[PDB]
Design an enzyme around this catalytic site. Sequence first.
Site, PDB file in Angstrom:
ATOM      1  N   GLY A  33      52.217  21.283 -18.942  1.00 30.85           N
ATOM      2  CA  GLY A  33      52.481  22.677 -19.520  1.00 30.85           C
ATOM      3  C   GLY A  33      52.757  23.715 -18.351  1.00 30.85           C
ATOM      4  CG  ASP A 165      42.601  22.667 -13.420  1.00 31.31           C
ATOM      5  OD1 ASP A 165      42.632  23.469 -14.616  1.00 31.31           O
ATOM      6  OD2 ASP A 165      43.181  23.138 -12.240  1.00 31.31           O
TER       7      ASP A 165
END
Length: 350
Positions: A33, A165
Amino acid sequence: ERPTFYRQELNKTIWEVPERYQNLSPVGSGAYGSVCAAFDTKTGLRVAVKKLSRPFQSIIHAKRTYRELRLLKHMKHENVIGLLDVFTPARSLEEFNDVYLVTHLMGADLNNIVKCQKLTDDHVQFLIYQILRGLKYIHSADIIHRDLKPSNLAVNEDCELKILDFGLARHTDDEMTGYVATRWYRAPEIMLNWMHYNQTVDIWSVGCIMAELLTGRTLFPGTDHIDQLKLILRLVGTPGAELLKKISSESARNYIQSLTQMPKMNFANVFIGANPLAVDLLEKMLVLDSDKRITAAQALAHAYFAQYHDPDDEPVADPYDQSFESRDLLIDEWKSLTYDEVISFVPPPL
Ligand SMILES: NC1=Nc2nc3cc4c(cc3n2[C@H](c2ccc(OCc3cn5ccccc5n3)cc2)N1)OCCCO4
């Protein structure tokens, strides 16, 4: 009440976001993304807005989208990135196709610190303490990060740190090939698929990061999987029979046994001049047998962290229901589960 949304071209794709978010400027883009920096006028925060790419294009993609949203919604800890906002411009499940995630805009990472400062032992203590504080929280929910490395650690100008992350299951085989930091911090049992791994894999990564903070150099900069294994076994010694028994792959076992045996090295002679307590902690995290590695909770009580350790300020997580991981659903069912989680989101307090 639905906020008013406005549209913008930005990357190569159309961005539709609530008016509260202003001054969008692209900062990164990938197959997961596109990401924009923005200013959230409602909170005064600089934020990262991530528009997921093809969130529901397959069952695997749809489940991963749900997994990411569930994880980010759960994480509520000073040393772990949380979710500031999640929104969709769709007004109903039938028109639901896009997902946007809003998190704190993170500036520097541990990489932008290791090769500039010499870092004092006090800075190393504080940085590793915070990683372990966040890891105690993550592990108490039975969440394994799986991909801890310096680029996944944000550090502000005050050496305050946040874990970023999580390893949501990707890193293709080609991304893990060769002389690449994507592999240098991974526990050997994950690197080579020796066995079903536990949350101790993250402690191995912390040892690699600690070492690098102390020396300014990568601990195990292997040119490939096998070279890296050789670097690891030179430091920690070849496995004994007890650990060999626990390697399930008869083919992985046979290969290990092809190597000339080597004893564990003296870490005081590897980490020359380091704090003896840092050396002791490294010896306890960089253990080949993951059953015997120190846990995050145990490491917080190690004398290396005496100036920061506070057992009443190292909290654990609420229970985290991961039963969905064992579930087989259709795309549209993962999508409706995801939609439910979008619309039930409640913002954190400021
Ligand atoms: N196609 C596909 N889709 C997935 N969705 C997942 C969702 C999961 C998950 C794994 C998931 N995978 C897998 C997947 C994930 C990570 C991988 O890297 C490590 C790795 C595996 N090797 C196998 C042989 C040799 C080297 C080697 N190196 C490899 C494959 N493969 O585990 C927990 C994270 C969240 O839950």
